[PDB]
């Protein structure tokens, strides 16, 4: 969110945060910037990508047996 | 370092020299600014003198109170002069002086 | 970039082993308050030295603002040290 990176460059998730915050700067209803909020929160934790990979692994294991 | 002098609440009075230098603000002191400076300094000196009699240090307490009063009064006068120049306080004389400039 | 600590860890292990060998060579055949004040002063000035290390290295990027910020920090701790001095906590 701050944009100060660990290695002296721009933060990894700073661009997503600036897209989300720019969306919220001209949208009084927060239900239309949800798609950018989800992107920012997914850049922080990679929950969706990890879930997809876990689903692929589980499907592979089920086919194994 | 990057700096920004813009304020959240805009100035309600005409703005002359939006970002004044220290020397120019000090050179903008009016009679009222000197009056409040001297008042604060004298009050501080008197309080220091009166409060230091019982311990037994009149001169040292006088000087300590005088330093406090000088610092406080100077910063108060600088605050008023800068606000007048920047347009946050009624700058009746400032606009008159800098219009003919 | 952090690969240079494994030699240090192996050095620690081998120094441990050689110290144990050295110990095994002959086997085969009231309260004072100033001691607390000195520790307090050490803690404060050790934190101050800690805060110097980022400043000294990164003194080329920051310029005339970080320098004066560090100067204000040192001024505050110098007032503290002067209070430490005149109160007799530095005497033994």
């Amino acid at each position: 969110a701050s944009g100060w990176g660990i290695t002296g460059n721009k933060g990894r998730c700073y661009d997503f945060w600036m897209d989300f915050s720019e969306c919220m700067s001209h949208c009084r209803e927060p239900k239309d910037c949800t798609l950018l909020r989800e992107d920012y929160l997914e850049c922080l934790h990679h929950s969706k990508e990890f879930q997809r990979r876990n689903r692929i692994y589980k499907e592979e294991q089920r086919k194994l047996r | 370092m990057n700096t920004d002098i813009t304020a959240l609440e805009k100035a309600q009075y005409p703005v002359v020299d939006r970002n004044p230098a220290f020397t120019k603000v000090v050179g903008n002191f009016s009679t009222l600014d000197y009056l409040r400076f001297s008042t604060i300094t004298g009050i501080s000196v008197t309080v220091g003198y009166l409060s230091g009699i019982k311990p037994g240090i009149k001169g040292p307490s006088m000087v300590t109170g005088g330093l406090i009063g000088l610092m406080g009064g100077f910063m108060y006068a600088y605050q008023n002069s800068a606000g007048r120049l920047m347009g946050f306080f009624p700058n009746d004389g400032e606009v008159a002086s800098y219009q003919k400039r | 970039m952090m690969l240079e600590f494994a030699p240090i860890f192996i050095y620690l292990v081998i120094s441990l082993l050689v110290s144990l060998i050295l110990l095994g060579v002959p086997f085969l055949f009231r309260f004072d308050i100033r001691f607390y004040l000195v520790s307090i002063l050490f803690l404060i000035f050790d934190l101050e030295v800690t805060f110097f290390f980022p400043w000294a290295v990164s003194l080329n990027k920051i310029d005339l603002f970080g320098f004066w910020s560090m100067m204000a920090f040192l001024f505050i701790l110098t007032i503290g040290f002067l209070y430490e001095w005149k109160r007799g906590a530095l005497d033994w």
Partner: protein
């Protein structure tokens, strides 16, 4: 003349100091073929990894 007899142990110390530094220059070179590089940054580390992979490939 006569003061050189106190420089013998003090020169043995210098010999030990020299051998400690020279023991890690011909042992580290022995199993790498290259002297140690000072100032390892992640660019140098990654570029060494790329060197190892390209040498292994061809």
């Amino acid at each position: 003349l006569v003061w050189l007899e106190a420089m013998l142990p003090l020169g043995i110390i210098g010999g030990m100091l020299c051998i400690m530094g020279n023991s890690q220059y011909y042992i580290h070179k022995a199993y790498h073929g290259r002297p140690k590089h000072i100032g390892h940054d992640e660019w140098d580390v990654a570029m060494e990894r790329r060197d190892k992979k390209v040498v292994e490939k061809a």
